C-alpha cells in the first residue's frame, strides 16, 4: 500500500500551478537579502 | 494510405505485367563523375622499356616483330630513352636487346597515325573474355579513342581495364570508361548526351576540361542481354532480351547519329550488328527491323552506314565442341581472328560498299549450312563433359606435414653494386647507422612488405597482431600465444591464413576509427544562439558559488535565496543567451591513423607512463627503442665507446602535441582534472626531451625543429651538420606529427586535402585516396606517425661493427624567396644545382664516386594535389639537367605517400626508411593506387613511373637516391642517400671482412631479438 | 635458445644414443633407442627441423624419414635432413622452440635423459628416473647414482 | 577556465525557429532518450529528454589579479607599416616576427635587397624558430570552433609553429636559404641561433636570420599555475611585494 505517489504528484502539481500563477500576476518574491 | 493504395495497384500491375524485379533491373546507374579514363600510355611504354631489359634475352628473339612494332606510337622521350637502353646494351655487350631497342627508337619516332585514326568507337557489353574485350584490344591497337560501358565500375574491372589498355594501347589510344546500365532508357540518355555535349568539371575558382568533342563514327552494340539462369525469367526474359537487343540498340543509333548531324554533314556514322541455324535466324529477324527502318526513313540514309557481319562460331565464351566441328567441316575462330575478320569490313572500300545501300557479309566458315543443330552438338558436349569435368580426384603426396613460421635468419639483399676504392676516409662519412617508424602499417618492416608485395608475412602478421592486442602470449595451461577473444592454442601454421584478414583491416589508409574513447561530438565548427526568458533550474550549492556565479550578473537578473538549497538563484530577463553548442559530424573522413588497437605497453611502456604523457611521446620512445634494437645497438653501447656530450638529439616534433593540446582544452572546459603537469608536457620539444630523459640520456645538442611537412628532413639536415662540424658523432634525429579532430576540420576547411565527399562521388575506393601523379588526385589524406632515424659518422660504426643501411652524401633544406601571391608556387630547391658539375650536390655525389646519372630512384614528396604534383616533376627535371643528367636515362619515382598518407612532421622518416629499404633489396615499390598519369607529367624527359614490383636484383644495381619535402609554407628539403656499399668501399680492404661480419651480427641479434620479445618475454624498454 | 638445429639434434642423439654402447634394457637388437617415446621424441624433433628451415609458410611439403632405417640410423637420418636443408647448421632456434622443446621432454613415457631447463624443478628434472644408469656400461661409475 | 558542471533536467526545452532537417540532426543521436513532437508553426521538431540527460552550461571564474610581461599596451603593429587586413587576418606572432625583423635590418643600416645585390640568394638561410607556435592563435581558433565563430578558413595553416617564420620569409626577406625552426620551450632562441652559425660554418650561407617568439595565453598562465612553477600571485601579495 506504498502511497506516496499520489502525495508526491499533487505537491508537484500544486507547485507548478503557483509557480504558473507567480509569473504573470507580477508578483515578485525573493526581494529580502541576508543582511545580518 | 490515400496514395498508397494507387501506389500498391501501380506496383502490382508492374509485377504482373512486367514483374517484381522490374524497378532493380531497370533502374539507373549512369553518373558522369565516375567516368575513367586509361590515356597513361607514354609511362606504361617507359615502365615496359625497363621490364624488356629486366627479362634475359632468351625470350626476345622469340617476339622480334611483335615488340619490335609494340613501341610503334609513343613520344620522342620513348625515344630517347629506348637509344639510352640500346647504348647500355652496347656497353653490357648484348646485340639482340641493342638491336631490339634501336629498332623501338626508330619507330617511336614515326609520327603517322594509327590505321584506326581519329575514330571513336563506342563498344558496349565489354567484359573479360568476349569479343567485345577482344574487338577492344584491336581499337586500341589501330589507335582510336574507345568508350566502354559496363554494368558496374568495381576495382577488378578497374584492373582488369587498366591491363587492357597498358597491354594493347598503340599510338595515340585512349580508352574512355563509363558504369551505364544498357536496360535503361535514362542511362542511354545520359549516355549519348555526354558522348556528345563536352564535359567541363567547373571547380570553385578555376574549371577543368576532361571532354572537348567526340562525334562516335563506329559502333559496336555488344552487350550482352544478360547471363543469368536462376530466376526462371523466361516469360519476363523473352520480353527483356528482345529489349535489350532491338529497342536498346536502335535508340542508341539513333542517339549516336543525333549528335553528330548538323555539326558536319557527309559524316554519317558506321554500326556493325553481331549476328548469331536458330539463332541465326533470330539474328536475321534482328536485322530485319533495323534495316527495314533504314529502308523505310529517308534521314537514316544520309546519317548512318548500316552494315552487319553473319559471324560464325568461337572457341571462346569447350574443347569437345571444337573438336565435334572441326569433325563436322566447319573452320572456327577464336576471339582475335574473328575480330580482324569483323573489323576488316570498317575500311575506306567496306564503307563505299554500305555508303548505298547496307552490306550483308558472312563470316561463317561452315555453319551457314546447318548441317548439324545446335542442340544436337549440345547433346554430345553435355553427354562428354559430365564425364570430363564430372570426375574430380586428388593425388596427394604420403607426408603432408604442417609448415612453420620461418625463423629469423639474415637478410638477403641485392648484390652489391661494384665502383673503386674511395680516397675519401670514414672520418668525413655520415652514415645512417639506424631508424624506425611507427605509422599507418606499424613499424618499418611490415610497411615495406605491405608496400612490395601487398601480403604480410607470417612476421609482419604476428608482429602486427601482437601489437594491435589481437595475439598475447601466456604460459600457464602450455606456453603459446592466446587470442584475446576467446583463449585458445593457436597454431603457428595457420598463423596467416587466420589472422592476415583481421590484421589488413585493421591497418593502412582506412576510415577514421575512435580509439581515444572519447564522444565524436564535442568538436566542431557550429553555430548556436539562442536567447532564452524562461526559469533557471539549479542544483544544490554553496552561498559562495552562487555569488560568484551572480557576480557578473546582478545588473542583468534578480537573485532570490532558496534556504532549503542553501544557494541563490539566478534568472535574468529578456535579451541574455545561454552557450548550448550544438555539435556536427563530417563523417566518413578516411585517415592514416596507427593501427588500430596499437598497445604500446606491450613495447615494455608502462602503463602508468602511457597514460600520464602524450602518445606523441609514447609513439617516440616506441619509435627510438625499435630503431635501437632493430640495429643491434643501445645507448649504452654508445656511450662505453664515445663520451655522453658526443651523442645528441635533434628529434624535432611537427606541431607538437595535437591530441595533447585538444585534451586539455576539452579538459579545462568540461572540468576533467587537467593533469597539472601536462601543459608542461604539451610543449613540442618535450616528446624528444622525455625520450632523452628516458631511454638514451644523451648530453648533446637538443635542437627539434618544426617545418610543418618536413620536419623530420630538416631535423636529419642539422644532424648531419653537427656529425660534419664535430660537435657529435651519434646523432638520433627524426620527428613526429598527429592527427585530430580539428585538423582534419581546419584541413577540410582549406579545401587542399581530399574531401570524402567528392571522392566518394567518382567512386574511388577508400584506402584509394592518395593517388600521387595520378589525373583524379584532388588533396592529400591527412596521416599520423613518424619515428626516429640514427645518424653516425664512418669512424664510430667502423670502429663499432654498426650496420650502415645508407650514406648521406648531401643534406639541405631551401625557401622560395619573395612570393605576395600565396598560390604562386615554389621552385627554391635548385639552389643544389648553381654551377652544373660544380654544384654542392654534384660535388659531395662526385666525392662519394657516384655520378648524375647515376642517381636512379627519387623518392618524390608527391602530396598528391593538384598543385604539387606537376611542379615539383618539374623541379626535379630541372635539378636533373642542372647536373648535368644524361639525355634519357631513367629515374624511377617512388611515391611513398600512396601507402602511407601524409603524416604532416613525419612524412622524411618513411621517405629516408624507405629509400634505405629499397636500396637495400633493390625492388622499386609500385603506386598501385595509380590508374593513368596527367597529361601535363609528359614534359619530363627523364622520370619512369612504376605500376608493378620492379625486382632488381643482379640486372640493375641501384646505387644512389633523392629524398625531396617541399614543406609547408615556402619551405623545402633535399637528401640524397649514396648505398652502403660507398662506406665499405671507402675503409681500406684489410677491414672491410671483418665489419661486414661483425654488422651482419649484429642485424641478425637485433631480429632475433625482436623475434624472442615477439614469443619468450624479456620486454623491450627495459628502464633500471 | 642459442643452438642451431644441426647442433641441437645432434646433442639429443648424443645424448640419448651415445656411441651404442648401452647394455641396459635396450628395446631391441639393431634399434639404438632405449624406449619408443625416445624416438618418437627424435622424430618429432626432426619434423620440426623442416617444418621451420624450409622456404614456405603456407602449405604442407614432402617430409623425409618415412618411418624406415633412414630414421632408425639417427645418424644418417640428421645428414639427409642436412643434405636438403644446408642451412640447418647455421640458422639458430626460434624463440617459440624452446617452449616447444620443454613441453616435448615432458611427455609420458620413459623420462629423457638430461634437464632441459634449469629452473625452480631442477631437481625433479634431474632426479626422475636416475636409477637405470648403474646396470649399463656406458656410464662411469663416478657418474651414475648407486 | 576549468570548472565541472553537471546537472540533469527534466523540464521543457524551448527552442527556435529552425528547419526540419536541423531538427532531425539534433534528434539524430536523441530518439531513444527522448520523445519527438513536432511544430508547425515553427516548421521543426521539439526534442523533450527525459531524467538522466545532462546539459553543459561551463561556468568560468577567473585567477584575479595575474601578472605577465605581455607586449606594451596599446601595441599597434600598423603603425610600422603593417597593412590591416594582413594583421588581422595572420596570428599576432606572425605579425611581431614582421615587426622584429624589419626593426633589425633597418636598425642595422640593412635590407635583404642589398644582400641579394651582394650574395646569391641561396646563401641567406632563416632559422627562425617560434617557442611553441601560436598559442593564442590556436586557442581563438578552438573558441571560434566552439562558438561558431567562422574562423579564417586558412588560420589551421596559419597556426602552425613554422609558418610565422615562413610568413616572414614569403614577405620581408624572401630567402632561399635553408629554413631550420627548432623548438626547446624555454631556449628556443638560442638553439636557433646555435644552428644559424652552424649552418654559417659550413658554408651553407653566410647571412643567417635566426630568432624566436613566443606568446603567453590564458591557458598558458592556468597551466603555469596548475604546476604552481611560475609566480603565483597570492603568496607574492602576501609577501608584501609590489607587482
Same mark, same amino acid.
Given at each position: 500500500?506504498?502511497?506516496?505517489s499520489?502525495?508526491?504528484?499533487?505537491?508537484?502539481?500544486?507547485?507548478?500551478?503557483?509557480?504558473?500563477?507567480?509569473?504573470?500576476?507580477?508578483?515578485?518574491?525573493?526581494?529580502?537579502?541576508?543582511v545580518? | 494510405?490515400?496514395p498508397?493504395?494507387?501506389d500498391?495497384?501501380?506496383?502490382?500491375?508492374?509485377?504482373?505485367?512486367?514483374?517484381?524485379?522490374?524497378?532493380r533491373?531497370?533502374?539507373?546507374v549512369?553518373?558522369?563523375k565516375?567516368?575513367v579514363?586509361f590515356?597513361?600510355?607514354?609511362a606504361?611504354?617507359?615502365e615496359?622499356?625497363?621490364?624488356?631489359?629486366?627479362?634475359?634475352?632468351?625470350?626476345?628473339?622469340?617476339?622480334?616483330?611483335?615488340?619490335?612494332?609494340?613501341?610503334?606510337?609513343?613520344?620522342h622521350?620513348?625515344?630517347?630513352?629506348?637509344?639510352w637502353?640500346?647504348?647500355?646494351s652496347?656497353?653490357?655487350?648484348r646485340?639482340?636487346?641493342?638491336?631490339?631497342?634501336?629498332?623501338?627508337?626508330?619507330?617511336?619516332?614515326?609520327?603517322?597515325?594509327?590505321?584506326?585514326?581519329?575514330?571513336?568507337?563506342?563498344?558496349?557489353?565489354?567484359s573479360k573474355?568476349?569479343?567485345?574485350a577482344?574487338?577492344?584490344?584491336?581499337?586500341?591497337?589501330?589507335?582510336?579513342?574507345?568508350?566502354?560501358t559496363?554494368?558496374k565500375?568495381?576495382?577488378?574491372?578497374?584492373?582488369?581495364?587498366?591491363?587492357?589498355?597498358?597491354?594493347?594501347?598503340?599510338?595515340?589510344?585512349?580508352?574512355w570508361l563509363?558504369a551505364?546500365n544498357?536496360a535503361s532508357?535514362?542511362?542511354?540518355?545520359?549516355?549519348?548526351?555526354?558522348?556528345?555535349?563536352?564535359?567541363?568539371?567547373?571547380l570553385?575558382?578555376?574549371?577543368?576540361?576532361?571532354?572537348?568533342?567526340?562525334?562516335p563514327?563506329l559502333?559496336?552494340?555488344?552487350?550482352?542481354?544478360?547471363?543469368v539462369?536462376?530466376?526462371?525469367?523466361?516469360?519476363?526474359?523473352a520480353?527483356?532480351?528482345?529489349?535489350?537487343l532491338?529497342?536498346a540498340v536502335?535508340?542508341?543509333?539513333?542517339?549516336?547519329?543525333?549528335?553528330?548531324?548538323?555539326?558536319?554533314?557527309a559524316?554519317?556514322?558506321?554500326?556493325?550488328?553481331?549476328?548469331?541455324?536458330?539463332?541465326?535466324?533470330?539474328?536475321k529477324?534482328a536485322l530485319?527491323?533495323?534495316?527495314?527502318r533504314?529502308?523505310?526513313?529517308?534521314?537514316?540514309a544520309?546519317?548512318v552506314?548500316?552494315?552487319h557481319?553473319?559471324i560464325?562460331?568461337?572457341?571462346?565464351?569447350?574443347?569437345?565442341?571444337?573438336?565435334?566441328?572441326?569433325?563436322?567441316?566447319?573452320?572456327?575462330?577464336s576471339?582475335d581472328?574473328?575480330?580482324?575478320?569483323?573489323?576488316?569490313?570498317?575500311?575506306?572500300?567496306?564503307?563505299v560498299?554500305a555508303?548505298?545501300?547496307?552490306?550483308?557479309?558472312d563470316?561463317?566458315?561452315?555453319?551457314?549450312?546447318?548441317?548439324?543443330?545446335?542442340?544436337?552438338l549440345?547433346?554430345?558436349?553435355?553427354?562428354?563433359?559430365?564425364? @570430363? &569435368?564430372? $570426375?574430380? %580426384?586428388? /593425388?596427394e603426396?604420403? #607426408?603432408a606435414i604442417?609448415?612453420?613460421?620461418? !625463423?629469423?635468419? +639474415?637478410?638477403?639483399?641485392?648484390?652489391?653494386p661494384?665502383w673503386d676504392?674511395?680516397?675519401?676516409?670514414?672520418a668525413?662519412?655520415?652514415?645512417?647507422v639506424?631508424?624506425?617508424e611507427?605509422?599507418?602499417?606499424?613499424?618499418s618492416?611490415?610497411?615495406?612488405?605491405?608496400?612490395?608485395?601487398?601480403?604480410?608475412? @607470417? &612476421?609482419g $602478421?604476428? %608482429?602486427l /597482431?601482437?601489437?594491435? #592486442?589481437?595475439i598475447?602470449?601466456?604460459?600457464? !595451461?602450455?606456453p +603459446?600465444?592466446?587470442?584475446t577473444?576467446?583463449?585458445?592454442?593457436?597454431?603457428?601454421?595457420?598463423?596467416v591464413?587466420?589472422?592476415?584478414?583481421?590484421?589488413?583491416?585493421?591497418?593502412?589508409?582506412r576510415?577514421?576509427?575512435?580509439?581515444?574513447?572519447?564522444?565524436?561530438?564535442?568538436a566542431?565548427?557550429?553555430l548556436?544562439?539562442v536567447?532564452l %526568458?524562461?526559469?533557471?533550474?539549479?542544483?544544490?550549492?554553496?552561498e559562495?558559488?552562487?555569488?560568484?556565479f551572480?557576480?557578473?550578473?546582478p545588473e542583468?537578473?534578480?537573485?532570490?535565496?532558496?534556504?532549503?538549497?542553501t544557494?541563490?538563484?539566478?534568472?535574468?530577463?529578456?535579451?541574455?543567451?545561454?552557450?548550448?553548442?550544438?555539435?556536427?559530424?563530417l563523417?566518413?573522413?578516411?585517415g592514416?591513423?596507427?593501427?588500430?588497437?596499437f598497445?604500446?605497453?606491450?613495447?615494455?611502456?608502462?602503463?602508468d607512463?602511457?597514460g600520464?604523457?602524450?602518445?606523441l611521446?609514447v609513439?617516440?620512445?616506441?619509435?627510438?627503442?625499435?630503431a635501437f634494437?632493430?640495429?643491434?645497438?643501445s645507448?649504452?653501447?654508445?656511450?662505453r665507446?664515445?663520451?655522453?656530450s658526443?651523442?645528441?638529439?635533434?628529434?624535432?616534433t611537427?606541431?607538437?602535441?595535437?591530441?595533447?593540446?585538444?585534451?586539455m582544452?576539452?579538459?579545462?572546459?568540461?572540468?576533467?582534472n587537467?593533469?597539472?603537469?601536462?601543459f608542461q608536457?604539451?610543449?613540442?620539444?618535450?616528446?624528444?626531451?622525455?625520450?632523452?630523459?628516458?631511454?638514451?640520456?644523451?648530453?648533446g645538442?637538443?635542437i627539434?625543429?618544426?617545418?610543418?611537412?618536413a620536419?623530420?628532413?630538416?631535423?636529419v639536415?642539422?644532424?648531419?651538420?653537427?656529425?660534419?662540424?664535430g660537435?657529435?658523432?651519434?646523432?638520433?634525429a627524426?620527428?613526429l606529427?598527429?592527427?585530430?579532430?580539428?585538423?582534419?576540420?581546419?584541413?577540410?576547411?582549406?579545401?587542399?586535402?581530399?574531401?570524402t565527399?567528392m571522392?566518394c562521388?567518382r567512386?574511388i575506393?577508400?584506402s584509394?585516396?592518395?593517388?600521387?601523379n595520378?589525373?583524379?588526385?584532388?588533396?592529400?589524406?591527412?596521416?599520423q606517425?613518424?619515428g626516429?632515424?640514427?645518424?653516425?659518422?664512418?669512424?664510430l660504426?667502423?670502429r663499432?661493427?654498426?650496420?650502415?643501411?645508407?650514406?648521406?652524401?648531401?643534406?639541405?633544406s631551401?625557401?622560395?624567396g619573395?612570393?605576395?601571391?600565396?598560390?604562386?608556387?615554389?621552385?627554391?630547391?635548385?639552389?643544389?644545382?648553381?654551377?652544373?658539375?660544380?654544384?654542392?650536390?654534384?660535388?659531395?655525389?662526385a666525392?662519394?664516386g657516384?655520378?648524375?646519372?647515376?642517381?636512379?630512384?627519387?623518392?618524390?614528396?608527391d602530396t598528391?594535389?593538384l598543385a604539387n604534383?606537376?611542379?615539383?616533376?618539374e623541379?626535379?627535371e630541372?635539378?636533373?639537367?642542372?647536373?648535368?643528367?644524361?639525355?634519357?636515362?631513367?629515374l624511377?619515382?617512388?611515391?611513398?605517400?600512396?601507402?602511407?598518407?601524409h603524416?604532416?612532421?613525419?612524412?622524411?622518416?618513411?621517405?629516408?626508411?624507405?629509400?634505405?629499404?629499397?636500396?637495400r633489396?633493390?625492388?622499386?615499390?609500385?603506386?598501385?593506387s595509380?590508374?593513368c598519369?596527367?597529361?601535363?607529367?609528359a614534359?619530363?624527359?627523364?622520370?619512369?613511373?612504376?605500376?608493378?614490383?620492379l625486382?632488381?636484383?643482379?640486372?640493375?644495381?641501384?646505387?644512389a637516391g633523392?629524398?625531396?619535402?617541399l614543406?609547408?609554407?615556402?619551405?623545402?628539403?633535399?637528401?640524397?642517400?649514396?648505398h652502403?656499399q660507398?662506406?665499405?668501399?671507402?675503409?681500406?680492404?684489410?677491414?672491410?671482412?671483418?665489419?661486414?661480419?661483425?654488422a651482419?651480427?649484429?642485424?641478425l641479434?637485433?631480429?632475433?631479438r625482436?623475434?624472442?620479445?615477439?614469443?619468450?618475454?624479456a620486454?623491450?624498454?627495459?628502464?633500471? | 635458445?642459442?643452438?642451431?638445429?644441426?647442433?641441437?639434434?645432434?646433442?639429443?642423439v648424443?645424448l640419448?644414443?651415445?656411441?651404442?654402447?648401452?647394455?641396459?634394457?635396450?628395446?631391441?637388437?639393431?634399434?639404438?633407442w632405449?624406449?619408443?617415446?625416445w624416438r618418437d621424441?627424435?622424430?618429432?624433433?626432426?619434423?620440426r627441423?623442416?617444418?621451420?628451415?624450409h622456404?614456405?609458410?603456407?602449405?604442407?611439403?614432402?617430409?623425409?624419414?618415412?618411418?624406415?632405417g633412414?630414421?632408425?640410423?639417427p645418424?644418417?637420418?640428421?645428414?639427409?635432413?642436412?643434405?636438403?636443408?644446408?642451412?640447418?647448421?647455421?640458422?639458430?632456434?626460434?624463440?617459440?622452440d624452446?617452449?616447444?622443446?620443454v613441453?616435448?621432454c615432458?611427455?609420458?613415457?620413459k623420462?629423457?635423459?638430461?634437464?632441459?631447463?634449469?629452473?625452480?624443478?631442477v631437481?625433479?628434472w634431474?632426479?626422475?628416473?636416475?636409477?637405470?644408469?648403474?646396470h649399463?656400461?656406458?656410464?662411469d661409475?663416478?657418474?651414475?647414482?648407486?
Amino acid at each position: 500500500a506504498a502511497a506516496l505517489s499520489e502525495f508526491t504528484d499533487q505537491i508537484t502539481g500544486r507547485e507548478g500551478v503557483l509557480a504558473s500563477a507567480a509569473r504573470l500576476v507580477l508578483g515578485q518574491l525573493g526581494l529580502d537579502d541576508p543582511v545580518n | 494510405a490515400l496514395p498508397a493504395a494507387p501506389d500498391s495497384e501501380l506496383i502490382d500491375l508492374v509485377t504482373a505485367e512486367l514483374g517484381a524485379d522490374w524497378p532493380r533491373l531497370v533502374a539507373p546507374v549512369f553518373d558522369p563523375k565516375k567516368a575513367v579514363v586509361f590515356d597513361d600510355r607514354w609511362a606504361s611504354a617507359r615502365e615496359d622499356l625497363v621490364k624488356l631489359w629486366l627479362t634475359d634475352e632468351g625470350d626476345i628473339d622469340a617476339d622480334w616483330p611483335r615488340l619490335a612494332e609494340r613501341f610503334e606510337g609513343a613520344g620522342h622521350v620513348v625515344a630517347t630513352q629506348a637509344t639510352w637502353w640500346q647504348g647500355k646494351s652496347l656497353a653490357a655487350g648484348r646485340q639482340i636487346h641493342a638491336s631490339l631497342y634501336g629498332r623501338i627508337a626508330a619507330g617511336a619516332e614515326n609520327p603517322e597515325p594509327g590505321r584506326y585514326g581519329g575514330e571513336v568507337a563506342v563498344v558496349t557489353g565489354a567484359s573479360k573474355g568476349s569479343i567485345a574485350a577482344s574487338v577492344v584490344a584491336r581499337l586500341l591497337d589501330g589507335g582510336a579513342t574507345v568508350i566502354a560501358t559496363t554494368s558496374k565500375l568495381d576495382e577488378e574491372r578497374l584492373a582488369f581495364y587498366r591491363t587492357l589498355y597498358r597491354d594493347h594501347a598503340r599510338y595515340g589510344a585512349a580508352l574512355w570508361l563509363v558504369a551505364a546500365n544498357m536496360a535503361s532508357y535514362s542511362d542511354v540518355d545520359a549516355l549519348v548526351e555526354w558522348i556528345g555535349t563536352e564535359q567541363t568539371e567547373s571547380l570553385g575558382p578555376q574549371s577543368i576540361h576532361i571532354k572537348d568533342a567526340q562525334t562516335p563514327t563506329l559502333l559496336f552494340p555488344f552487350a550482352a542481354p544478360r547471363v543469368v539462369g536462376d530466376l526462371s525469367e523466361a516469360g519476363s526474359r523473352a520480353e527483356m532480351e528482345m529489349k535489350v537487343l532491338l529497342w536498346a540498340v536502335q535508340r542508341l543509333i539513333g542517339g549516336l547519329s543525333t549528335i553528330g548531324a548538323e555539326r558536319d554533314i557527309a559524316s554519317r556514322l558506321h554500326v556493325v550488328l553481331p549476328g548469331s541455324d536458330g539463332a541465326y535466324g533470330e539474328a536475321k529477324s534482328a536485322l530485319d527491323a533495323v534495316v527495314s527502318r533504314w529502308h523505310a526513313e529517308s534521314s537514316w540514309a544520309a546519317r548512318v552506314s548500316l552494315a552487319h557481319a553473319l559471324i560464325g562460331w568461337t572457341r571462346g565464351t569447350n574443347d569437345a565442341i571444337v573438336a565435334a566441328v572441326e569433325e563436322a567441316g566447319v573452320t572456327t575462330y577464336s576471339t582475335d581472328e574473328m575480330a580482324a575478320l569483323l573489323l576488316d569490313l570498317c575500311d575506306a572500300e567496306s564503307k563505299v560498299a554500305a555508303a548505298r545501300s547496307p552490306i550483308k557479309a558472312d563470316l561463317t566458315g561452315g555453319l551457314a549450312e546447318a548441317n548439324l543443330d545446335m542442340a544436337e552438338l549440345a547433346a554430345k558436349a553435355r553427354e562428354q563433359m559430365s564425364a @570430363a &569435368a564430372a $570426375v574430380d %580426384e586428388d /593425388a596427394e603426396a604420403p #607426408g603432408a606435414i604442417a609448415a612453420l613460421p620461418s !625463423p629469423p635468419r +639474415g637478410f638477403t639483399p641485392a648484390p652489391p653494386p661494384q665502383w673503386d676504392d674511395l680516397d675519401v676516409d670514414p672520418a668525413d662519412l655520415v652514415v645512417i647507422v639506424g631508424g624506425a617508424e611507427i605509422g599507418p602499417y606499424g613499424s618499418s618492416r611490415t610497411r615495406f612488405e605491405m608496400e612490395v608485395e601487398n601480403e604480410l608475412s @607470417a &612476421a609482419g $602478421v604476428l %608482429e602486427l /597482431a601482437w601489437t594491435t #592486442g589481437l595475439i598475447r602470449w601466456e604460459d600457464d !595451461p602450455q606456453p +603459446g600465444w592466446y587470442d584475446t577473444e576467446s583463449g585458445e592454442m593457436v597454431d603457428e601454421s595457420e598463423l596467416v591464413q587466420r589472422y592476415h584478414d583481421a590484421v589488413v583491416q585493421r591497418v593502412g589508409i582506412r576510415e577514421f576509427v575512435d580509439d581515444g574513447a572519447i564522444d565524436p561530438d564535442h568538436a566542431s565548427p557550429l553555430l548556436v544562439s539562442v536567447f532564452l %526568458e524562461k526559469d533557471f533550474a539549479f542544483v544544490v550549492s554553496s552561498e559562495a558559488d552562487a555569488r560568484a556565479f551572480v557576480e557578473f550578473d546582478p545588473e542583468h537578473t534578480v537573485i532570490r535565496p532558496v534556504p532549503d538549497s542553501t544557494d541563490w538563484q539566478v534568472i535574468r530577463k529578456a535579451g541574455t543567451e545561454i552557450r548550448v553548442p550544438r555539435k556536427t559530424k563530417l563523417s566518413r573522413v578516411v585517415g592514416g591513423q596507427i593501427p588500430t588497437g596499437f598497445d604500446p605497453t606491450v613495447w615494455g611502456i608502462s602503463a602508468d607512463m602511457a597514460g600520464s604523457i602524450d602518445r606523441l611521446a609514447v609513439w617516440n620512445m616506441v619509435a627510438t627503442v625499435d630503431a635501437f634494437l632493430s640495429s643491434g645497438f643501445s645507448p649504452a653501447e654508445v656511450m662505453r665507446y664515445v663520451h655522453p656530450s658526443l651523442v645528441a638529439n635533434t628529434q624535432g616534433t611537427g606541431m607538437g602535441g595535437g591530441t595533447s593540446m585538444q585534451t586539455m582544452y576539452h579538459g579545462n572546459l568540461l572540468g576533467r582534472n587537467k593533469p597539472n603537469d601536462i601543459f608542461q608536457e604539451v610543449l613540442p620539444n618535450i616528446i624528444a626531451a622525455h625520450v632523452v630523459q628516458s631511454y638514451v640520456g644523451s648530453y648533446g645538442a637538443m635542437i627539434h625543429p618544426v617545418a610543418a611537412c618536413a620536419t623530420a628532413a630538416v631535423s636529419v639536415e642539422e644532424g648531419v651538420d653537427k656529425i660534419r662540424l664535430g660537435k657529435a658523432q651519434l646523432v638520433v634525429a627524426g620527428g613526429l606529427d598527429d592527427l585530430t579532430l580539428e585538423g582534419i576540420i581546419g584541413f577540410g576547411d582549406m579545401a587542399a586535402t581530399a574531401d570524402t565527399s567528392m571522392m566518394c562521388g567518382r567512386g574511388i575506393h577508400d584506402s584509394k585516396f592518395s593517388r600521387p601523379n595520378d589525373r583524379r588526385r584532388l588533396g592529400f589524406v591527412e596521416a599520423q606517425g613518424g619515428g626516429t632515424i640514427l645518424l653516425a659518422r664512418g669512424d664510430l660504426a667502423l670502429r663499432m661493427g654498426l650496420p650502415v643501411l645508407a650514406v648521406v652524401a648531401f643534406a639541405q633544406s631551401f625557401g622560395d624567396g619573395v612570393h605576395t601571391s600565396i598560390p604562386a608556387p615554389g621552385l627554391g630547391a635548385l639552389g643544389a644545382g648553381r654551377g652544373g658539375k660544380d654544384s654542392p650536390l654534384a660535388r659531395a655525389l662526385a666525392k662519394l664516386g657516384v655520378a648524375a646519372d647515376d642517381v636512379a630512384v627519387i623518392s618524390k614528396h608527391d602530396t598528391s594535389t593538384l598543385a604539387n604534383d606537376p611542379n615539383e616533376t618539374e623541379l626535379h627535371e630541372r635539378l636533373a639537367d642542372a647536373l648535368g643528367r644524361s639525355e634519357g636515362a631513367p629515374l624511377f619515382v617512388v611515391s611513398q605517400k600512396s601507402l602511407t598518407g601524409h603524416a604532416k612532421g613525419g612524412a622524411a622518416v618513411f621517405q629516408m626508411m624507405g629509400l634505405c629499404q629499397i636500396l637495400r633489396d633493390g625492388v622499386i615499390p609500385p603506386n598501385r593506387s595509380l590508374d593513368c598519369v596527367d597529361d601535363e607529367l609528359a614534359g619530363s624527359a627523364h622520370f619512369v613511373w612504376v605500376r608493378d614490383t620492379l625486382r632488381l636484383g643482379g640486372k640493375f644495381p641501384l646505387k644512389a637516391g633523392m629524398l625531396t619535402s617541399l614543406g609547408f609554407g615556402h619551405v623545402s628539403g633535399l637528401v640524397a642517400l649514396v648505398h652502403p656499399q660507398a662506406f665499405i668501399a671507402s675503409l681500406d680492404p684489410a677491414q672491410r671482412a671483418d665489419y661486414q661480419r661483425r654488422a651482419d651480427a649484429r642485424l641478425l641479434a637485433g631480429q632475433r631479438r625482436l623475434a624472442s620479445a615477439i614469443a619468450g618475454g624479456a620486454p623491450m624498454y627495459q628502464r633500471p | 635458445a642459442d643452438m642451431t638445429y644441426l647442433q641441437w639434434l645432434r646433442r639429443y642423439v648424443e645424448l640419448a644414443i651415445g656411441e651404442g654402447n648401452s647394455t641396459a634394457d635396450t628395446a631391441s637388437v639393431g634399434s639404438p633407442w632405449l624406449a619408443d617415446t625416445w624416438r618418437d621424441r627424435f622424430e618429432q624433433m626432426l619434423q620440426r627441423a623442416e617444418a621451420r628451415l624450409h622456404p614456405q609458410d603456407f602449405g604442407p611439403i614432402q617430409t623425409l624419414f618415412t618411418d624406415a632405417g633412414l630414421l632408425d640410423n639417427p645418424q644418417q637420418a640428421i645428414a639427409a635432413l642436412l643434405a636438403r636443408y644446408p642451412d640447418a647448421e647455421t640458422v639458430q632456434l626460434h624463440p617459440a622452440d624452446v617452449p616447444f622443446f620443454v613441453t616435448l621432454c615432458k611427455t609420458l613415457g620413459k623420462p629423457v635423459n638430461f634437464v632441459p631447463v634449469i629452473d625452480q624443478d631442477v631437481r625433479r628434472w634431474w632426479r626422475s628416473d636416475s636409477l637405470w644408469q648403474a646396470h649399463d656400461a656406458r656410464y662411469d661409475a663416478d657418474a651414475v647414482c648407486i
